[PDB]
Amino acid sequence: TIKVGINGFGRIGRIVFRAAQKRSDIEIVAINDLLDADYMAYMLKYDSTHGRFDGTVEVKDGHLIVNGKKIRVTAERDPANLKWDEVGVDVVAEATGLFLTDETARKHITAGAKKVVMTGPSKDNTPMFVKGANFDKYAGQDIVSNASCTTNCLAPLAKVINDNFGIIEGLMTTVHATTATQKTVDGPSHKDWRGGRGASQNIIPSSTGAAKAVGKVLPELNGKLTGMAFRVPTPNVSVVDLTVRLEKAATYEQIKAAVKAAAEGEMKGVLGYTEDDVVSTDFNGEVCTSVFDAKAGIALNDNFVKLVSWYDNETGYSNKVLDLIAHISK
Amino acid sequence: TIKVGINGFGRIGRIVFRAAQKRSDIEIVAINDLLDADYMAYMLKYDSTHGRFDGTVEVKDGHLIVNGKKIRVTAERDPANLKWDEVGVDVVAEATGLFLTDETARKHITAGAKKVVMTGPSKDNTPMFVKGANFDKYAGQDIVSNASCTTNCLAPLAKVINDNFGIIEGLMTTVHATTATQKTVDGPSHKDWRGGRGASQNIIPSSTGAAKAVGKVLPELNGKLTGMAFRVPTPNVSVVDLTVRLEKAATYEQIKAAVKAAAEGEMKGVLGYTEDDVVSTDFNGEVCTSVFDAKAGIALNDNFVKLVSWYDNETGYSNKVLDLIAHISK
Amino acid sequence: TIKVGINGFGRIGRIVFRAAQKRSDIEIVAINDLLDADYMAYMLKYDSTHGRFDGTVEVKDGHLIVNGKKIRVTAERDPANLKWDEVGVDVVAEATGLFLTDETARKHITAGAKKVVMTGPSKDNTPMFVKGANFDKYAGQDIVSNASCTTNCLAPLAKVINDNFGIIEGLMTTVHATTATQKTVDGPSHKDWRGGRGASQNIIPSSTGAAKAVGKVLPELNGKLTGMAFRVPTPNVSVVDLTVRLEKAATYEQIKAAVKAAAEGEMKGVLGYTEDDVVSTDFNGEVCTSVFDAKAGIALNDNFVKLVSWYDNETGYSNKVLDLIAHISK
Amino acid sequence: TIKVGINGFGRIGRIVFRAAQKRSDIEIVAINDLLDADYMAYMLKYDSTHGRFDGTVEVKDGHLIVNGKKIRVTAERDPANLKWDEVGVDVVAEATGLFLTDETARKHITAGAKKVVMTGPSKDNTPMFVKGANFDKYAGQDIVSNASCTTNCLAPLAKVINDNFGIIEGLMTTVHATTATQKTVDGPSHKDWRGGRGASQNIIPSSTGAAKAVGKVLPELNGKLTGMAFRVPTPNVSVVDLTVRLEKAATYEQIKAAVKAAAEGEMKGVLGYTEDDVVSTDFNGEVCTSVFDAKAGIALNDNFVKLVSWYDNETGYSNKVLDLIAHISK
Ligand SMILES: OC[C@H]1O[C@H](O[C@H]2O[C@H](CO)[C@@H](O)[C@H](O)[C@H]2O)[C@H](O)[C@@H](O)[C@@H]1O
Ligand SMILES: OC[C@H]1O[C@H](O[C@H]2O[C@H](CO)[C@@H](O)[C@H](O)[C@H]2O)[C@H](O)[C@@H](O)[C@@H]1O
Ligand SMILES: OC[C@H]1O[C@H](O[C@H]2O[C@H](CO)[C@@H](O)[C@H](O)[C@H]2O)[C@H](O)[C@@H](O)[C@@H]1O
Ligand SMILES: OC[C@H]1O[C@H](O[C@H]2O[C@H](CO)[C@@H](O)[C@H](O)[C@H]2O)[C@H](O)[C@@H](O)[C@@H]1O
C-alpha cells in the first residue's frame, strides 16, 4: 500500500480520511493538525453532514487507533518538522490551505515524504490535475495539486462537450453550498466583504477561479470559459450551471447521449449521468465529481445550451485526491 | 382615488395590501378569501419576512378597520357573487392563483368591478404588462395580467441590453427564494416531483416560463431567450443570472453605464443599479423590480456576458401590481 | 412472517417501509395512498433526510418490486375497500393520520386485516402502547395505537426516573424539528395560527399532548406531567427537556447511573445513554426512541433536575411501530 | 449629551450604534476596531438581520460622517492608547469581548474616559446591572457590566414572579439563536466541542451562566435558579423557558395579571406582555429585554409552572447598554 500522511484535519482532511478506509491501495498512517488526539477522534466519529464514522475509533497513548490500525497524531506548525519518514509516509495530502506553493509544500519532502498532493488550487506554477481531464499528462512531478471541487465538476463535463461539439465560448455559474470560510451571522471578512454576511440568511455572490483553471488542465479551453458563484444556505452539495455556444450543431438529445456515453465509458466513476427528478441532497455522499442532470438542462437552439451538473463538494473532491495519490504513485 | 378589491390574501395579496397604504392614488376597500376577519388581521399584523404592520389594525363587526379605514371582509368561493359594486370597487387585484383566464376572471366584472389585474401570468391570451417594458402598449383592455416576479426582473434588464447592444440570444437562470408552493419536508407534489422535496434542505431545479414570457411583453425578443430556476433555502429575494450574446461589441463598462443610465432615467423606480457588495437580504423590501449588481457580473469578451440582477419577489412585484392598476385607470 | 399493509405513504409510512426491510419477522406486502406506483417508487428511492434507499426499486405492471419482492399498490380512499385479504395482510400500519378512531380504523378489519396499528395517538379510547413503558399491558386488542414520537421519547425516561426516585411533578419541553404540517413561508393554518408561520425563519411555540399521554401508558404518572413544544428550523431529530421534582434525593450521578442501567438492561434498544458531546444530527437514523444526554442535563439540587433526551422523530417511532406489530402478533 | 466611544464593532457594537441614533441623551463620537473606515461604513449600512441603516453614511478623510455627524475611527489594539479624551468621550461601551476585567477595562479610563460599560458579563468582581432588576443599586462605580442578553430576559421576569409569589426553585432553558461564536459547517472549537458543529444543521446544547448570574443582580435569588441553552438555526431572537416552583399558590391567570401589571407599570419598556399568537420573528427589533408570552406558558398546578419570554438577543440588550450608560451618567 501507499502510506499517506494528512496535513490538516478540516473538512477535506477528514473526508479524505473516511474515503480512504474503503481503499486497498492506500493507508493513512499519520495526521497532523493543531488538535488533541481526543478532539480529532471526536471530529472523525461524528459528522453533521455525513453521519457517524463507519468503524471503530479509539485514543491510546495520545495517538489514534482506527479500525484497529495505529495512526500517529502530531501538532507541528512547521511542515519541515513533521518527521514523515519515521512513519514511512510516501505521499502527503496537504489539506491545511496554507502551503499551496512549491517552496512551502516542498518542506514535506525535506521532512521525508516522497510526494505531495495539495488539496486546493496551487498559488504558483505547481501543476494541477483533474481526473477525467488530464491525469494522463502527469509527468512524474513530486508536488502536484488536485485543483478545486468546482474545477473537478466543470472540467470533465467541458471536455466531453468540447471533444464532441466544440466549445466556442462558455460562462459558468456555480450555486454552491456554504463552506467553513463563511460566517454564521454578519461578521468581519476583510478580503471578501460579501462572504462575511450571514450564510444561513443569504444568497451571496462570490468569485471563483474554476472556469479559468479549466484552461490550465485543458489547454484547448484556455480563454474560452469563465464564471462566478452564488453561495446559498445548504451545508453541502453544489451545482454547476454551464452556458455554452457550440461550433457543431447538437440537439439536446445528442448532448445527453454524448454525456451518458462518457459516464458509462472513458469517464466512468468520474462523470455521472441521471434522468431522475433529483435535488441536491440526492448527491450527499456522491463519489462522481460531476453528475449531469439531463432533465434540468435546457437548449435555446442547436448551438446555445445550458447544462447542469451536480457535485458533492466534499466527497467527490476527496475521493479524487486519493485517486491522484494513487496515480502519481504508479 | 381608485377603489381596489383584493381577491385572495396569500403572500401577494397581503404585500399588495401593505404596499397600497403609502399610495395616494389607490385605496383598498375590500378583501375576499376563506379566512375569518380575526385571522386576516393576524396575518396582516405579523409577517416573518417583512416585520410588523406599520399602522393600526382592528376587527369590528366581522370586518377590518385599517389605519382608521373600514375594509369589507367576505369569504365567497364564487367570484360572480362578490358584490364588488356594493363597496364601489373600480379594479380587482386577482391574487388567488385560481382565476387566470378571461372566462374565470371576467366574473369579477359581472359582479360589478370595472377592471381586473391578475397577479400572475395569464393562462390564456389575456395580455401581460410589465412596467419598464410595455405599459405603454396598454390598449384599454378590461382584464390584464402583471406577468410574474421573474419576468418583472428579466424584462426591464433585457430591454436595456437589447436596445443598446442587440441580444442575439440569451439563457437565464433564476436563483429563487423558497415559496408557498413548496414543502417543509419531502411530501407529495404530483405535478412537480422535485418541488415536493424538503425546501430548507435542498437546491431544487425548477421550471420557469419567465424568459419565454419576456417574448410576450417584448415581441422583438420572441424566441431569443429561455431559462430555468433553482429554488434555494431562503424565505425571500431572488436573483436573475442572464447570459447573453450581443450583436454590438460592448465592454462591461459600457454595459454598466447603459444600465445605470436607464436606472436614473427612463426606468427610474423600476430598474435599479448598485456597485456595492450586496447580498440577497439587502433587497428585502426592495421596490425596484430589477436591481443590477455591477460587481457580480462578468464578461468573457465584448460579445458574451453574464449579468446579475436582484428582485424582492414579493415586494417589487406587489408594488408594480399597484402601478398597473393605476396605469389602466388613467 | 407477519404480512403488513401500509395505509398512507407519508414520512412515517415511508420510514416504516425502510425500517421493515432489515427485519425477518415482518414483510410489507402492500401500500395504499393517492400516489402512482412510479411516484411511490421515486419517494422511496430518494430521501432528503435519510439518503438513497439501500436496495432495488422497480415499477412493473403498476405495482412495485422492492428487493425482488412484489408489493401491491392501490389508491383507495375508503379503507373498507382495501381488499387486504387478497394479499394476505395480517396487520395494517395505519399511517394516513385520518383514521384514528375505532369506527374508522376498524374498516381495515372489515376489509380482511386481522389487526391495526395506528401510527399516531388515537382520538378515542383506542389503547396506546409505548415500548419500554407498557407493551406488557397489551391484552389481545385488535386495534391499537403506538402513541406519538414525543411520547415514545418521554415515557421510557419518565418510567426509569419515577421507578427509581419517584416523580412528584414534572414539566416538559420538546425542541422539535419542522414537520410536514408546517409551511415554508407564512401561510394559512386555521386551527393553529403560529404553526402557519414560515418554518425555516422561526422558533414556533406549539402544543403537545405527549406529557399528558404519558399518563395513559403509565397510569402511575397520570396528572403529574405536562408540557409544550417549540418547533425549530431543522428537518429531523428532536429533543426532550424534562424538569422534574423527585421524592427521593438523587444526585446527578445517581440519575445518570440509573438511566445507563436501563439502557443496558431492561430497556436496551429503546432507551439509549451517551456521555459524548452530541448534537441533533448525531441522531439522524437513531433507532432508540429516547437517548439520554448525560452532559447536557443539569441538577439544581438532589430533588430538582432537568434531563435531556434525544429522539429521531421519524426513525425511532417508525421502528417501534414495527415492534408493536410484532408484539401484538405473538 | 453624554459622549460615547464604542470599542469593538461586532454585532453588539453595531446595534448599539444604531439604537443610539434615536436617543437625545447620548451621542456616539468614536469607534475603535481592526476595520477600515470604508469597511465600517459597509457593515453599518447593510445588515442581514435588521435591514438597511436608517440615515446617511459617508467616509471622509478616513473617518465616518453619520447623519451629518463626524465620528472618529481608529484601529488601536491597546485600550490605553485610545486617546478618548481627544474626542471628549465620557463613557466607553466596551464591546470587544476581550476586556471583561477591571485591570483590562480600566485602561479606557487611563486613556481619558470617565466610565466604562462592558457589554458582556464581567469575568471578575466588576458589578453587573440589569434594568428592571438592580439599576437602583448602582453606587457610583466607574466600571460596570450590563451582564448578558439571556440575563436581561430572565432577571426582570424572575423578579416579578419572586416578588409576587416567591420562587422556591427554578430551572431555565433558553432556545437561542445562532451567534458569531458558532461555525457554518463542522469546524474547530477547542473549548466547546458541540459549539463547533454546523450551526444551520443542528440543535446544539450549550452552557449558560445566565440563571446563576441572576443571583448576582437579584441576591434574594442566589442559589435558587440555574439553566442551560439550546442553540438553533435562526439568525436572531431567542426565548426563555422558565420552570419554577412557587411558595404562594398562584393560578396561571394570577401570573399573567402580575406580569402584565409590571409590563404596564414599574417595568414598562423593559418587560413586555403579549397574548397574541407570536413567533420569534415577531420580535426582530424588539426593545423590551423580556416579552412574556401568555398563550405559550403552561401550569401543571398552582405551585409549579413553565413561563415563556422572548428577547431579541441583539436589540434589547443593545438598547439597555445605552440605558445603563445614561443611568451611570446621572
Ligand atoms: O478589502 C477591501 C475591499 O473589499 C471589497 O472587495 C473585496 O471583497 C469583494 C466581495 O465583497 C471581492 O469581490 C473582492 O475581490 C475583494 O477585494 C470591496 O469591494 C473593495 O472595494 C474594498 O477595496
Ligand atoms: O406527474 C408525473 C410526472 O412527474 C414528474 O414530472 C413532473 O415533475 C417535474 C419536476 O420533477 C417537472 O419538470 C415536470 O414538468 C412535471 O411533469 C416526472 O418527471 C415525470 O416523469 C412524471 O411523468
Ligand atoms: O382558529 C381560531 C383560533 O386560532 C388561534 O388558536 C388556534 O391556534 C393556536 C396557535 O396559534 C392554538 O394554540 C390554538 O389551540 C388554536 O385553537 C387563536 O389563538 C384563537 O384565538 C382563534 O380563536
Ligand atoms: O477542551 C477539551 C474538552 O472539550 C469538551 O469540553 C468542552 O466542550 C463542551 C461542549 O462540547 C463544554 O460543555 C465544556 O465545558 C468544554 O470544556 C469535552 O467534553 C471534554 O471532555 C474535553 O476535555
Author numbering:
A (entry chain A), B (entry chain A), C (entry chain A), D (entry chain A): 2 to 331
Relevant lines from the article:
Glyceraldehyde-3-phosphate dehydrogenase (GAPDH) is an enzyme that catalyses the conversion of glyceraldehyde 3-phosphate to 1,3-bisphosphoglycerate using NAD+ as a cofactor and is known to be a moonlighting protein. Under normal cellular conditions, GAPDH primarily has a tetrameric conformation composed of four identical 35 kDa subunits. GAPDH consists of an NAD+-binding domain (residues 2–148 and 312–330), which is composed of α/β dinucleotide-binding folds or Rossmann folds, and a catalytic domain (residues 149–311), which is composed of eight antiparallel β-sheets with an α-helix and several short loops. An important region of GAPDH is the S-loop (residues 178–201), a long, winding region of the enzyme that is known to interact with some proteins.
In this study, the purification, crystallization and cryo­protection of Escherichia coli GAPDH (ecGAPDH) and the three-dimensional structure of trehalose-bound ecGAPDH are described. The GAPDH crystals were cryoprotected with a solution containing 15% of the disaccharide trehalose. The monomer contained 330 residues, one sulfate ion, one trehalose molecule and 171 water molecules. An electron-density map clearly indicated ordered tre­halose molecules bound to the protein. One trehalose molecule bound to ecGAPDH in the S-loop region. The S-loop region of GAPDH without NAD+ bound as a cofactor is very flexible and does not exhibit definite electron density. Despite the absence of NAD+, trehalose stabilized the S-loop of the enzyme. As a result, the electron-density map of the S-loop region of the protein was clear. The rotation of GAPDH also induced a conformational change in its active site. This suggests that the binding of trehalose to GAPDH induced a conformational change in its active site to prevent the binding of NAD+, although the NAD+- and trehalose-binding sites differ from one another. Although sucrose and maltose have similar structures to that of trehalose, these sugars did not bind to ecGAPDH and glycerol was not found, even though glycerol has previously been reported to be bound in GAPDH structures.
